[PDB]
């Protein structure tokens, strides 16, 4: 088996729903980090790229019909380069990284690109075909996030809880208080505001140019103005006996990210800078109704196989779909609610979460943080709608 | 060291015609059919040990939305502890599921996996972009059954947005594939498929969908050369691709088990073939049908296997023009006996996400019947790709 | 300075098709044109460039009936481009409102020769989708226009409710004490009388056929499709109410959802003479009434009382009453309020909408033409046609055979 | 033996401001918008016994959106009128609101009614999209169509025989066939803007208007479409709608707009009973048809029909309110009727190029504004006339009391 190295990595800013990136087609948005990789890495012979693997949760809109291939062509990569799109909802972009890793480790490829995209602003409506002539039963459904075309058998067996309902279920089952959720959310906002001011995100970001030209360069989901008092006043999404609010949850967002992965031979050939070795990826399943706890079996599976303890990681990038689930996962894994190595630059409550891009962001930001801190091993892990988790481990070199 | 990977049991639904026998069956329910059959057929498996379900699906806007692999495993009655992920390389999605499952086991990250694919083209929805302004007068519905929607002007200007049949006409023109040769190939597909269906070959691959649907519906066994000759080309009288020398739009699902040697033992599986490798290739979108050529060359060069060494070649028949052009470029006769011996998608149809899984499982099936050793499955991909996967009977 | 007498002359209609049935393939504008084409063929003395106006009723106007179907239909029918058209909407009463509006135009001296009619293709009624009220709105929705509420105003719901038409008919059954048994008996008489009229060739005298293309050749639709002549009291008794076990309105004691068109000529005495028409009845007058939306089926009562008080005609003086049968509960309630027996011989002698169906815009025109037809066959003198209207109205129109 | 026709009087009249597409009134449902002038008539006329209103006649060209299912009746209920009052909706496209007035007149004249309300509404901002039903299971042929203005669900037989020219295409056809120059069209457009600006500044429109309340609440008080600073240079620079060889521009055409209007009509006996002020007698209405492809010339046969029957010359009118769908057709109509392009009695306060034209509301506006102008000027007879899509015209004559 072959060592696999993450090399350059870059992302767009993350836009708010209907905000700074809402006019940018998903395929064009995916192409932005690909074009930046080309510009940033002039020693690469681009016709040698073996594959572009991209995560995308939707695929009904301008991201239809294999957005990985659409994006590589729009980015100016040669038509000889193949592309494939992966869908594990919020974990899609991490699955692109781990799939790229397995292709190189198994000797099938040498040089690849992995990343992800989502334009939740531009997610379309969908309408099933008529099932009879002159049918009176036509319906439009929003694909921005969550259930559509509900199967009655899925509802009867597993339920079709909304994402916030699942987060309330985790809060109840794992006993995560509203006060702790809000404290976690505030720390995310404070840490993200500090990282933004320090120029940490700027080092990850390439601008999006929109045709005078408008240039989008800053993550705009952040709410640095957040106070505990303001969080406390919010009403829960699902009623007064519940805990999840708009303030202790991520949002729906737009963005894309990409990075290069390479064998040792490809690193040398293409003049790349190897930044981390990929150690491995593991997935896990849980009940849909408590999907937020999905990371726990994934992390345990990966760490047990690699012979690494959770405490051995110098950074943990844990997706913040909801504070209730971030906290429940940390507690289950034996990590403090405010452990210093967890989400040190904040996370999705502040930054937002374009589903397909989010997992690629967690890997690239974990690597970035290992470089800043001089850490060795990093873990990125996230929950998945309909009850999964994904975990991926890297080691700085 | 890398780990050997074995394909074990494999099963599929029949392939239904658009609006036909399977049109009432939701894509998620359809995907669950072969998964439930793998449970029934493999009594020694401890199902909570399955590491992953990988499924191909080209659409994902309809009842196949939000990661159909995971939806399908839950509907099939598999434990909720089992993860799933959905792959999209258009017509090659199901083959990509197989090769992706292979790489996961080969690299030591998994031991027992299911790979498959689904498409319900009958039930593909319409899509409507959001309004870009309040009171927008510019709202539009687009069909997602097959082909371009939400066309990007930059894609059109640089690469074109040729329909799939237009790309097949382009291949016929550029590679000099005559109408007569296309029709001869189509007739052989129908003849061979009708023979295989009479011999019970497809029946050995099929689990019924419950009215019991048990037979592939797309076959036209009555096809004659005279009948094909009369047909008018899709794109006008100067062109060559017709409805008779092209595949169709179809519904179906397929799945198979892959396992390490240790998992084969533990779960009482029957190892049937070793997976040798997978490769992908890119070509100009406008001649997408030629995509298999760089994929096959890449795979064979890496493995050190000549194309002539394969005892079966399962080449997707999206169009006779591209099937023929691919064979000619690879130095294989238009009617070579090892190519599509039981016919192909012209006769059988091609639900996009399921097709590539069908090619792998039917190649293996054919090796078993014939006593052959190495098999190659390969197919073209819209927007200009190819994928190839090689196996070896145990 | 005096008003002018107004005569109804020739009148014709398509058959009435079932939803999704015999006429479902026919665009609403083309369907409206069918009776217009028949009037042209049937009345060859008319100088067609003299027609002052075509008035057509249509309740929907969102589909192929959009943008003034009266004018679309007259052009499709081959009438001169010089002929104006206008479309009226009083829901189920639209076609009757077309007749009365044509009458008022001639009575007031403003016109001499007109066509009045109505159309509905409920099979082909489209879906509607409001515009986005913001960029990237997540709140887009489709709504069926086949029948009943869409784009509900919360202020309408809060003040008057948005009861479905069958719910209003249950409200009438409750408030006016009309039993399930009586509703089903009325429905059975409608079916029996319509089956008898069909067998007698009565409907055939009113109908122009519609030609339809099939794969192997053409067919003609010549018979009303909605009738259920094998209806029995037992069959009706077994049906479940639309709105739950404590209710009374069923699919069997209500009209349906249907397709059809009708049209007729109205003319001054001078126009009858000039154009070689055959005058058949004089129009006496039209009146409208309003009631609570939640009991819309009782709407005919104020309309009939208003018209008859003004004309000085008792309800009992009419030799035919054509009362729309939207629901048996409301047909019965109206008769009871007006002092007419539930089975009075002069009411709906050839059956009504429970048997025949009710394409909204066409229905009111049908009631007028069939009342006149029945007067001619029976030797009767005065006729009354009246019908209820969604959102709480009634309309009534009286005629007298020449 | 018939009795005597009854004289019919227009009494109070009122309108909303006219909003731009997606502009000041875009948030207001058509049914609620229609109710605004009805509520104002109630407030303005306390002598009326409202349960005596025989009918509310309203024009509306669309009827697919919040104006569905007989907007006249919807609006009268929303306005607080008793549930005993009937309502009916008329559709002659851009002439609907005028057809409501004339239909109300005929109902009173023929003795069938005594006290009625006539008006019209359009919310073109909020006009919905429409989608035909599937004709077959798993149909691949589903389509959305905009109902804001103009053709949808095109019939191939209509297209083949008469064409399906857009309204601006018809206006180009009129420019071509009637020889109306781009320069003349632009000059007409400029005079519309100048006259409307002067009228607005003089408080003339304010006398006709009731404000609309908007959720935020704020009020909308003034017509939004006017471009008072319009120059000929700017008009000259505009590109034609239909391509470089044509003449119709956005600057010499009406717009797409939102608004509602209503007025009271009454017999002499009702005027007395309800303490109304009779303001004009209605003399008559006539309609006419022309080729769809040149629909803008529709007013010519309607005006000729009406004036011939009444025995009034076009030159006898003290005001002519001619709808300005397009300058090309406004000019072509005047020329055919022998009236100068800039005749002082024509549109003295400007027209739809400046003010806009919510289809169902526009014809009611023309009638009420013609009456207003007769009062201001001391004139006697007024003519209101308009063109209609798919080839019609409508004309209505009044006489100040
Ligand atoms: C009342 C209404 C809801 C019924 O709709 P529906 O259920 O689709 O009507 P159907 O004709 O399919 O009848 C329903 C069932 O009752 C049965 N039924 C109806 N009339 C029957 C009869 N006379 N004898 C026996 N069975 C009868 C039908 O056969 C059917 O049974 P099925 O489903 O097994 O075939 C619908 O017709 C409606 O909305 N009508 C009101 C229209 C209106 O408001 N305006 C028109 C009057 S102006
Ligand atoms: C003619 C029509 C197609 C134009 O629609 P539109 O293009 O959306 O109109 P706009 O208001 O945007 O005007 C278009 C442009 O011309 C400019 N323009 C219009 N009038 C102008 C003037 N007087 N001075 C300067 N510029 C002017 C606008 O500012 C605008 O510039 P921009 O769009 O680049 O910013 C449309 O108004 C229409 O269909 N009207 C016909 C109505 C009809 O058939 N019936 C109603 C009357 S009965
Ligand atoms: C129903 C499948 C939608 C995917 C698009 C089809 C075109 C692929 O080549
Ligand atoms: C097809 C008709 C649409 C009009 C709405 C019908 C409801 C009337 O009571
Ligand atoms: C909003 C109005 C819809 C009616 C169509 C307008 C076209 C008339 O010429
Ligand atoms: Cl989701
Ligand atoms: Cl995240
Ligand atoms: Cl295939
Ligand atoms: Cl009826
Ligand atoms: Cl106007
Ligand atoms: K994976
Ligand atoms: K519906
Ligand atoms: K098998």
Author numbering:
A (entry chain C): 1 to 211, 215 to 400
B (entry chain B): 0 to 209, 217 to 400
C (entry chain D): -1 to 400
D (entry chain A): -3 to 212, 216 to 400
Quoted from the paper:
The A-mutant and AS-mutant when soaked with 3 mM Hex-CoA and Oct-CoA, respectively, led to two complexes. The AS-mutant-Oct-CoA complex comprises of cleaved Oct-CoA in which the CoA remains free and the cleaved octanoyl derivative in the form of octanal (OAL). In the case of the AS-mutation, the disulfide bond was not detected as a serine is present instead of cysteine. In AS-mutant-Oct-CoA structure, OAL was bound in the tunnel of all monomers except in the C-monomer where both CoA and acyl group were missing, and that position was occupied by a glycerol molecule. This may be due to the fact that the AS-mutant-Oct CoA complex is obtained by quick soaking (40 s) and this duration may have been too short for the ligand to bind to all four monomers. HAL and OAL moieties are stabilized in the proposed tunnel via various hydrophobic interactions. Interestingly, both the HAL and OAL moieties interact with the T143- G146 and R148 tunnel residues which are part of the covering loop. The calculated surface area of the tunnel is 235 Å2 and the surface areas of the HAL and OAL are 124 Å2 and 152 Å2, respectively.
Degradative or 3-ketoacyl-CoA thiolases are involved in the thiolytic breakdown of β-ketoacyl-CoA to acetyl-CoA and shorter acyl CoA molecule and can accommodate long acyl chain substrates. In this study, a degradative thiolase, β-ketoadipyl-CoA thiolase (PcaF) from the β-ketoadipate pathway is explored. The pcaF gene is located in the gene cluster pcaRKF and encodes the last enzyme of the β-ketoadipate pathway involved in the conversion of β-ketoadipyl-CoA into succinyl-CoA and acetyl-CoA (TCA cycle intermediates). The overall structural assembly of PcaF monomer comprises of an α/β topology β1α1β2α2β3α3β4β5 together forming a characteristic five layered thiolase superfamily arrangement,.
